Design a protein around this ligand. Structure first.
Ligand SMILES: OC[C@H]1O[C@@]2(CC(c3ccc4ccccc4c3)NO2)[C@H](O)[C@@H](O)[C@@H]1O
Ligand SMILES: OC[C@H]1O[C@@]2(CC(c3ccc4ccccc4c3)NO2)[C@H](O)[C@@H](O)[C@@H]1O
Lengths: 811, 811
C-alpha cells in the first residue's frame, strides 16, 4: 500500500498538517463532527484538504504567465472527459502516500473515500478523453495552456442495464457540489444570438440580438511534480440581468437561455444538426474568444496576435472560432479584412478526428442565417476569397471549386465546417499516421494539393499519470524498481524494460501484478453487482462506445463460436475466458441499443449452460466511463481493437491496454498500426482486411451472402439469431441485426470472421503458456512509450503552436 | 465609529486572528491576491471569516437540543424576509468593532464591504419580515426553534423606475453565491404530487405519484450574545434521480419540477390561486413534516408528539400541514383517525395576518383533487367530523354549519383554508389587539363561539437588534450611555428614558443622532442616484408595499394640497418637507402601478416649480427592501401609517419608525392603537375615522361625491388629476385613479382627507419647535419596548407552545 515508492513520501509534519486540515474542513467547511460524519463527508474533507495544496501553485503559475508573457495555447473543445480529480491531484503533487497515511491515522480507508467521487463525465469517449489527457500533458510540459469548454449540468448519461437493455439516466454530477472548480461570476461575459446585421457608417453592426451570459468556472490542472497548475475554464449559461402570470412565466422562461449548458449531446462519431447544439458551439466560441482578446490586450497592434495566441480546434465543433475571430477583428476592432484574415489563419489550427461522412458537421444555411446572421455573411466572404485562390491555383478546374467550396449545394444548402476549418487554419492534422495520410490522399486531397504545408500528423496519446501511475500503481512500482521514476514524464524510457524479457524476477512480478489487478476487479464486480467471474480465466475485454464500426458484433460472433464449439465437443479443453464488453450506446442509435441487448442475451444462454459452466462467461460491463476504465483496463489480458480497417481514426483505449499489460487482438486500423510497429508485429494479434482489402471489396460490392454460404459455423450462428435461440420468448427479436449483417453491413463483419476466429485461437494457444504470454506482454509495455500524450503535445507545441515544451520545475 | 461601545471590543489577539483568517480566505477560498482582489472579493473574505465564528456555536447548539431534548418549535412560512446577514452576525456575536478594526488595518472600509451583500429578499413585506424577526427573537430567547420555508432562486423582484413607472427585474440574489447557507444534499427528501388513492388491506395508499426532491439548505440564526445559533432550513426543488430528441428533452424537462422553488409569488395581501403556488405550499409542508417526524423518532408512542413538537402556521400558506400530518399518522404510521386528530390539533397552531377577503386562501376542490387526492379526502373527513361537533353544540343551526364548513359552495367549489386551520389548531391568533378582537367579533365569530379558548392575541414585534443596534448604532449608543446595554434584549428598559425628557444633554444627543442619520441618507441618495434632497427639511416617509388600503393616494392628496397652498400664497412660510414614498407594487396590480406613476408625476411638477424650490420635494424611493428600510427609517422625522381603520392587521413598519426616533401620523388601525396607548395619544398624530366610523359609512353607503362637493381644495386636486395637470402629454393618464376615488373607493380616501390635512398642519406646527419635537420623540422611543419581537415570542412560547424562554448563555 504505502510500500509503493512512486506514491511519494509520508513526511511526519506533512501527515500532521494534513490531519489537522482534514479535521478543520470537517468542522468549518462541512459543519460536521465525527458523530454524524459519513464517508461522503470524509471524502469532501479530504478533497478540500488536497485542493488547498493546489492554490499557491495555481496563483503562482498564472502570475508567472503574466510576467513571462509566453505564447498562450487555447484548446477549444465541446468535450472534456476528465474523470475523477482527487487521486490525480495527489499523484501530481506527490501527496498520495501522505494522504493515505493521514487518513489511515484517522481510521479511514482513502480508497473507499476515492470511490465516493463522481466522474466529471463531460465527454462521450475518445475525443473528450483526449482533451483531458492533453490538458494533463500541457501542464506537465510547462505550456501556458488553457482548456476551454462548456460546464454541462449533465454529462454523459448514466447507463443502467434493465431486462438486458440500456436505460439512460441523467448524470447529475454536481448533486453534492464540485470541490475542484472555482466559480468566477465576476468574469461573466455576454454571448449574442439571433438579431440582424446593419451595414452603416463604421461598417457592419450586429444588432437586436438576444443575450445569454457565459459564467466561467475554473478548474486547476496540475502538471506532474513541476509546480505548474494550469486552468480549464468551462462556461455555464446564465439568463441576462434585465400581469402576475406574465411576471412569473418571464422568470421561469430564464430556463430557456440556461438550457444551452444543460446537457452534453451523447453522440459518438455522429453529427446531429440540432439548433441547441449550434448554440452550445457558438456559446463556447464567443465567450472564449472574448477572454483571449482581453488577455491579449492586457499583456503589453493585432500583428502580434498569432505570436501570443494559438487556438486549437478539437474537431469542427468550435469551428465558429474562425468567423467569430474575423467578426471581432473586422466589426469591433476595425481591422481591414485582409489583415484580419492573415491574423486568423496564423492563430487557428484544426484537428480532424473522424472519417465517417455522418460524423462531419454540415449546418443548414437557413439555421446559420437565423441564429448567426453576421457569421453566415463572413463565411460567404471567406468562401468567395478562398475559392478565388483555388481558381487562381487551378484555372478552369470547376469541379474542384465545387468540391472545395464551404457551401454544399442540394435540397438543403449547408456549410461544410471542415472546409471552413481548413480554409481558416494554418495547420490541419489527423490523429494517427494512417488517418492523417488518408486525409491528404482522399478526404481533403484537393485541400492538400492547394496547401500541402498545412497538413500534418499528430498521433494520439494517453497520459501515463492517469493511465499508469494512478490506475495501476503495482505495475508503476515494479517498473520504477528497475528503471527509476523518470519514465513517468519520459515514457520512452520504458524501452529499457526490453532488457528484462528474460529476467525471472520481472517476469514473475509482471504476472503477479496482473493477477492482483484481476482479483481486485473481480472483487469490484462482486461488491457492486454481486456478479461472480472466474479469476483463473482469460479476461477478454472490449470497452468503448457501442458503434457498428467498432464491431462489437464481430466479438459477439466469436463468443457464440466459442459456445457452439464447446457444445459440439464438450470434452475438449479450452482456455477459460471471461468475455467482457462495455460501452454506452447513443440514446437515438437503435442498432447500438440492439447490440447491447444481443450481448446480454448471449450471456443469458452461455452463462447458464451447465455444459459450459465457468469455461466461458459473457458479461456486459454496465456504465463504462473513465473511472471504470481505470479499474478494468489494468485487469485485462486481451484488448479487443477490432474496428473495420479505415474506420477508427486512431483509438486511445488501445494505448491504455498496451500500457497496462494486455496483449492486443486488432485490425491494422488507426493507431493499432503504429502500436504494432513500435512493439513488432510478432507481439500483436493482427488479423483481417487491411484498408486496401476493404477498398477492393467496395470496388466489386460487398456480398455478405458469400461468407454465409461458405462458412458453416457462421451459418449456424446466423440461424441461431434468426430462429430465436438467443431470444426464445421473442424469436424475431434480432431480425434487424440479422438483416443488417446479411444485406446492409457497411462494416463487413462477415468478411473478417474467419481470420478473427483463427487469430483468437492463437490468443488461446499463447495463454496456455504463461511464461511466453508474460514475455510478449513485457515486449508490449516496454514499447508503449510513443503513446504518451507528452509526446503528442510536444509535437503540437513544436510543429503547430511554435512553443518549446519544458519539464522545468517552478519554485 | 469604534467609539461606539455597543459594538463590542476590538481585542488585540482577536483583531490579529481576524486579519489572518481574512487573508487565509482571500487566498484559499477566493483564490485571489491583493493585486486582482475587488471590493466584492473583500466582502466575501470577511463574510467567510465571520461565518467561521458561528460554526462551533451552531454545532454545539444543535447537539445541546439533542441532549436536553426540549420541545421543538417549527415555524412554517412561505416567506422569510431576512435582509443582509454580515452585520447582523457581527452584532449578535459581539464582533462588529473587532472586524471594523481588522478591516481598517487591512486598508478597508467595512461599511463599503457591507453594501456589497444582496438582501435575502425571500418575502413580500411585513409577513416575511415578521418571520425573520421571529427567528432572531427565538434564538435570543434560547428556544429550540426551526424556521422552515422555500429557498426561492428569485426573491421579491428588483424594482426599477423608468419613465416614472415600475419595472420588474429578476432578483438573482444567488448570482455570486450565498456564503451564509450550508447546502445539505445528503438530507434530501421526496415530495409527492398528483397520483391517486388506493384503499386496500392496510388502508389508504397514495400511489402513481410524481416525485419532486426537496434539498435542504441550512442558514445559521444567531441569538444576541447568548452563544445560541438556531437553524433556518429552506427547501430547494430538485428533479428525481430516475431517441436523441427524446433524451435531450427529457433532461431539459427536469426544469419543470425544479420550477417549484424558482420564484416568490410577489403578492402582498392577495390570494392568487395558481397551481404552482399550491405546489410550493405542499412542497414546504411535506418535506418539513418528514423532518419533524424523523427528529421526533430519533429522540428516545405518538402520544408524546405534541409534547415534543409545535407547528406554527404563518397564515394559511402552510395549512396543508394539517391534512399532511393526518395523512402521515393515519396512512403511514397506522394510527386510528381519532388519536391522529388529537395529536394534530395539539401540535398545530394558526396565526392569521389578514382581513381583506381577497387575501384569504380558497382553493378549488378540482385542483386539490388532481394535485393532492389523498389530502382532499382527508379534508372532507375533517370537515364532516368538525361540522358534527358544530351540529352537536348548536343543534338545528343550519346556517352556522354552512358558514363554518371547510367547503365553500358555489359555481366553483372551494376549500376555505382558514376554516381548515381553525379546525385543526389548538390556538388561533391575530397579530394586534384590534385585529385579534375583530377575529372573534366578526370574521371567525362562529368559531369563537364554538371554541373560545382557541382564540388569542399576539401583537407583532420587531427585533431591536436589526431595527436599532444595526441600523441606528448612534441612537443605540446614546441610549446605552444612559441605561447600559441590557435593553438590547429587554426592550421594556427603554421606559427608563422617560427620566430624560428634560435632560438637556439627551435632548441634544437625540436630535444630533437624527441629523446624522438624515445626512447619511442624503449622502446615499446623492451617491447612488444623484438625487439631491434638502437636509434642513422634514423627512416625511411612507415606506411599505403599494396597496389601496395603505392609502399612498391619501398621502398624494396631501402632497398636492401642500403644493397648491404654496402656489396660492407663495409668501407664506411653510415647514420645508421632503416627502418620500417607496414600496413595490405587485406586477399584476394595475392600480398600485398607476399610484407609483402618480407619485413620480406629482414629483415631476412639484420638484421643478421655481416658486416651490426646496420648500417641498416629492421623491419615490426606488426598490424599497429590508436593506433600504435600515437606511431610511433612522433618517425619518415623520412616519406615515395611514391605512383605513380596520384594514392593516398590525403593521410592523410603524414599530420600526417609533423605535428610531420618528413621530407617527396615523389612523387608529392595527398596532398603531397600541403604540399610541404605550406612548400616550398626546404623543401621536392620530387622525381620521375609527373602525366604528368606517362601519357607519358602510351602513349608509360611501358617497365620495359628497366630500368632493363640500371640500374646495379636494375638488381642485381631482380636477388637476382629471384635466391632465400632472400628465400634460397624456391628459387622461390618471382617469382610472379619479374614477376609483369618485365611484369605487373601498378605502374611503376622501373621508379622511380633511382630518389628515389638519393633522399634518399640527405636525408642521410641532416641527417648528425643535425642542418640543425632540421631547415628544423621546416619549416615543422610551415607550417602544412593548414592540420588541422578544415580547411577542415570549408570549407565543408561554401561551401557545408551552415552552419557557431563556436569556441564559451557552458555554
Ligand atoms: O482523436 C480522438 C478520437 O476521436 C474519435 C472521434 C470522436 C467523436 C466524438 C464526438 C463527436 C461528436 C460529433 C461528431 C463527431 C464526433 C466524433 N470520438 O473518437 C475517433 O473515433 C477516435 O478514433 C479517436 O481516437
Ligand atoms: O403580521 C405581519 C403582517 O402581515 C400582513 C399580511 C401580509 C401578507 C403577505 C403575503 C400574503 C400572500 C398571500 C395572501 C395574503 C398575504 C398577506 N403581509 O402583511 C399584514 O397586512 C400586516 O398588517 C401585518 O403586520
Amino acid at each position: 500500500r504505502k510500500q509503493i515508492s512512486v506514491r511519494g513520501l509520508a513526511g511526519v509534519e506533512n501527515v500532521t498538517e494534513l490531519k489537522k486540515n482534514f479535521n478543520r474542513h470537517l468542522h468549518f467547511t462541512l459543519v460536521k463532527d465525527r458523530n454524524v460524519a459519513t464517508p461522503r463527508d470524509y471524502y469532501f474533507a479530504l478533497a478540500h484538504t488536497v485542493r488547498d495544496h493546489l492554490v499557491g501553485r495555481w496563483i503562482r503559475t498564472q502570475q508567472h504567465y503574466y510576467e513571462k508573457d509566453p505564447k498562450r495555447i487555447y484548446y477549444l473543445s465541446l468535450e472534456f472527459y476528465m474523470g475523477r480529480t482527487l487521486q490525480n491531484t495527489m499523484v501530481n503533487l506527490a501527496l498520495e502516500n501522505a494522504c493515505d497515511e493521514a487518513t489511515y491515522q484517522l481510521g479511514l480507508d482513502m480508497e473507499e473515500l476515492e470511490e465516493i467521487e463522481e466522474d466529471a463525465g463531460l465527454g462521450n469517449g475518445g475525443l473528450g478523453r483526449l482533451a483531458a489527457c492533453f490538458l494533463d500533458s500541457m501542464a506537465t510540459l510547462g505550456l501556458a495552456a488553457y482548456g476551454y469548454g462548456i460546464r454541462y449540468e449533465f454529462g454523459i448519461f448514466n447507463q443502467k442495464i434493465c431486462g438486458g437493455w440500456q436505460m439512460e439516466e441523467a448524470d447529475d454530477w454536481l448533486r453534492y457540489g464540485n470541490p475542484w472548480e472555482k466559480a468566477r461570476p465576476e468574469f461573466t461575459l455576454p454571448v449574442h444570438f439571433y438579431g440582424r446585421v446593419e451595414h452603416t457608417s463604421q461598417g457592419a453592426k450586429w444588432v437586436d440580438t438576444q443575450v445569454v451570459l457565459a459564467m466561467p468556472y475554473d478548474t486547476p490542472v496540475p502538471g506532474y511534480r513541476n509546480n505548474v497548475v494550469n486552468t480549464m475554464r468551462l462556461w455555464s449559461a446564465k439568463a441576462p440581468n434585465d400581469n402576475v402570470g406574465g411576471y412569473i412565466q418571464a422568470v421561469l422562461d430564464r430556463n430557456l437561455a440556461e438550457n444551452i449548458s444543460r446537457v452534453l449531446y451523447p453522440n459518438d462519431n455522429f453529427f446531429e444538426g440540432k439548433e441547441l447544439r449550434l448554440k452550445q458551439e457558438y456559446f463556447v466560441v464567443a465567450a472564449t474568444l472574448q477572454d483571449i482578446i482581453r488577455r491579449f490586450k492586457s499583456s503589453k497592434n493585432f500583428d502580434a496576435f498569432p505570436d501570443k495566441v494559438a487556438i486549437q480546434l478539437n474537431d469542427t465543433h468550435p469551428s465558429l472560432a474562425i468567423p467569430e475571430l474575423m467578426r471581432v477583428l473586422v466589426d469591433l476592432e476595425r481591422l481591414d479584412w485582409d489583415k484580419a484574415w492573415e491574423v486568423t489563419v496564423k492563430t487557428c489550427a484544426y484537428t480532424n478526428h473522424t472519417v465517417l461522412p455522418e460524423a462531419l458537421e454540415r449546418w443548414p444555411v437557413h439555421l446559420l442565417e437565423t441564429l448567426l446572421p453576421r457569421h453566415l455573411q463572413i463565411i460567404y466572404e471567406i468562401n468567395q476569397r478562398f475559392l478565388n485562390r483555388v481558381a487562381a491555383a487551378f484555372p478552369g478546374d470547376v469541379d474542384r471549386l465545387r468540391r472545395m467550396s464551404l457551401v454544399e449545394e442540394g435540397a438543403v444548402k449547408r456549410i461544410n465546417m471542415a472546409h471552413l476549418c481548413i480554409a481558416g487554419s494554418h495547420a490541419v492534422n489527423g490523429v494517427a499516421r494512417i488517418h492523417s495520410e488518408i486525409l491528404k490522399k482522399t478526404i481533403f486531397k484537393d485541400f492538400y494539393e492547394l496547401e500541402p504545408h498545412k497538413f500534418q500528423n499528430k498521433t494520439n496519446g494517453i497520459t501515463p499519470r492517469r493511465w499508469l501511475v494512478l490506475c495501476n500503481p503495482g505495475l508503476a512500482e515494479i517498473i520504477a524498481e528497475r528503471i527509476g521514476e523518470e519514465y513517468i514524464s519520459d515514457l520512452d524510457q520504458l524501452r529499457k524494460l526490453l532488457s528484462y524479457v528474460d529476467d525471472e524476477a520481472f517476469i514473475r512480478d509482471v504476472a503477479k501484478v496482473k493477477q492482483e489487478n484481476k482479483l481486485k476487479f473481480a472483487a469490484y464486480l462482486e461488491r457492486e453487482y454481486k456478479v461472480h467471474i472466474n479469476p483463473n480465466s482469460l479476461f477478454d475485454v472490449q470497452v468503448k462506445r457501442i458503434h457498428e464500426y467498432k464491431r462489437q458484433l464481430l466479438n459477439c460472433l466469436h463468443v457464440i463460436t466459442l459456445y457452439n464449439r464447446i457444445k459440439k465437443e464438450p470434452n475438449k479443453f479450452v482456455v477459460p475466458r471471461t468475455v467482457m464488453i462495455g460501452g454506452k450506446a447513443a440514446p437515438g442509435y437503435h442498432m447500438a441499443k440492439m447490440i447491447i441487448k444481443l450481448i446480454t442475451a448471449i450471456g443469458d444462454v452461455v452463462n447458464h449452460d451447465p455444459v459450459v459452466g465457468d469455461r466461458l462467461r459473457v458479461i456486459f460491463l454496465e456504465n463504462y466511463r473513465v473511472s471504470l476504465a481505470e479499474k478494468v483496463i489494468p485487469a485485462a489480458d486481451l484488448s479487443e481493437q477490432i474496428s473495420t480497417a479505415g474506420t477508427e481514426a486512431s483509438g486511445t483505449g488501445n494505448m491504455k491496454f498496451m500500457l497496462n499489460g494486455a496483449l492486443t487482438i486488432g485490425t491494422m486500423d488507426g493507431a493499432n498500426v503504429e502500436m504494432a510497429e513500435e512493439a513488432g508485429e510478432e507481439n500483436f494479434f493482427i488479423f483481417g482486411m487491411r484498408v486496401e482489402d476493404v477498398d477492393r471489396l467496395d470496388q466489386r460490392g460487398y456480398n455478405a451472402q458469400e461468407y454465409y454460404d461458405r462458412i458453416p459455423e457462421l451459418r449456424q450462428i446466423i440461424e441461431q439469431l434468426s430462429s430465436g435461440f438467443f431470444s426464445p420468448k421473442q424469436p424475431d427479436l434480432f431480425k434487424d441485426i440479422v438483416n443488417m449483417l446479411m444485406h446492409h453491413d457497411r462494416f463487413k463483419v462477415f468478411a473478417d470472421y474467419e481470420e478473427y476466429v483463427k487469430c483468437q485461437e492463437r490468443v488461446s494457444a499463447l495463454y496456455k503458456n504463461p511464461r511466453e504470454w508474460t514475455r510478449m506482454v513485457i515486449r508490449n509495455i516496454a514499447t508503449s512509450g510513443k503513446f504518451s500524450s507528452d509526446r503528442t503535445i510536444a509535437q503540437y507545441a513544436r510543429e503547430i503552436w511554435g512553443v518549446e515544451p519544458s519539464r522545468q520545475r517552478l519554485p
